[PDB]
Design a binder for this molecule. Structure first.
Ligand code: ANP
Ligand code: F90
Ligand code: MG
Length: 318
């Protein structure tokens, strides 16, 4: 049995693929500190967001394709590696870490050292868009242009790939987080109601959509003037309005990617289509929106949230 693992350190979720097993951990990238000291990591910690008492704090070491808090991140990483380490397993843990293309050497050097103090002896790195493409099952080894769009929590990465390499690759600070922000702003600018990020993220999943039809839900927030709990009903349409901008910035980046794609490679993409991954790819109607604005066929990968991890794992086994 092996202790070799691949890690996808996301702003929102962290996944770990273990050689021989598969994906063996899937927990939010949240750490809870009590007055500091590591109190809870992952699933527990996330449930505390916007609900912590005065002597506690719920943190996301990564926010927007970066590591805003390095020390808390190191603990998170260490905890997850610790949590999945198999004492009956071999040593010399080989560790592949997924990393964005907009990744500074500062962020890399830290990621690396963090694994070494966690028990890693060797540490390899792999590009997120590559890991995503592989996980989604694209023929990134063949002589054909394959375009992948990994919409995550803090960033979206659009990349064209072929011959085991990257033809084009760009990262934009837009994703789920900003999609949540947009909903929070909409509720504030149109219903004078303040809502939390948890409530926002739930609205996104329950009625969020890139395009209006309709369907509706009840939002539990607070009225700004009299500062007391109130709830307003919101519709699929209203939801689309809130999300128009962040959705638009995704579509744009997808176009910019194409304009920068040589004619031959661009055709291969129009044949099979564009592949969306990441949790942001689960936003209803997003694939359809991109499809319309680009004219190209769009397909949502299977288990979008796991593509990067599964792509990293495939490499770990070869
Ligand atoms: N059904 C859904 N509809 C809309 N958004 C969703 C849905 N499910 C998950 N998300 C969002 O997907 C985002 C995280 O997806 P994820 O692919 O895990 O990104 P990440 O890898 O964790 N972080 P990063 O890649 O660095 O941007 C979160 O913002 C979620 O809110
Ligand atoms: N998974 C992503 N592409 S965003 C978070 C991140 C992960 C690693 C490093 Cl070094 C920086 C930011
Ligand atoms: Mg990601």
């Amino acid at each position: 049995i092996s202790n070799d693992i691949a890690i996808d350190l996301g702003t929102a979720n962290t996944l770990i693929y273990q050689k021989g097993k598969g994906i063996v951990l899937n927990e939010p990238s949240v750490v809870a500190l009590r007055n500091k000291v590591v109190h809870a990591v992952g699933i527990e910690a996330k449930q505390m967001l916007g609900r912590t008492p005065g002597h506690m704090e719920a943190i996301r070491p990564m926010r927007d394709g970066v590591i805003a808090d390095f020390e808390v991140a190191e603990e998170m990483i260490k905890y997850f590696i610790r949590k999945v380490h198999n004492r009956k397993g071999s040593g010399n843990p080989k560790v592949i870490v997924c990393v964005p293309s907009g990744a500074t050497a500062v962020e890399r050097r830290a990621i690396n050292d963090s694994c070494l103090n966690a028990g890693a002896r060797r540490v390899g790195l792999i590009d997120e868009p590559m890991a995503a493409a592989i996980g989604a099952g694209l023929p990134i080894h063949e002589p054909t242009g394959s375009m992948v769009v990994d919409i995550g929590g803090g960033t979206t990465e659009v990349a064209v790939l072929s011959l085991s390499g990257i033809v084009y690759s760009r990262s934009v600070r837009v994703g789920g987080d900003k999609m949540d922000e947009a909903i929070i702003s909409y509720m504030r600018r149109h219903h004078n109601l303040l809502i939390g990020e948890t409530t926002a993220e739930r609205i996104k999943k329950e009625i969020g959509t890139a395009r209006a039809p309709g369907l509706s839900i009840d939002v539990k927030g607070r009225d700004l003037m009299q500062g007391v709990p109130r709830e307003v009903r919101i519709s699929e349409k209203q939801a689309a309005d809130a999300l128009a901008e962040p959705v638009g910035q995704i579509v744009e980046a997808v176009k910019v990617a194409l304009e920068a794609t040589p004619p031959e490679l661009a055709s291969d993409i129009a044949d099979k289509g564009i592949m969306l991954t990441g949790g942001g790819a689960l936003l209803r109607g997003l694939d359809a929106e991109i499809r319309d604005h680009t004219g190209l066929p769009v397909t949502v990968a299977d288990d979008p949230l796991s593509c990067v991890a599964l792509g990293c794992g495939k490499v770990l086994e070869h």
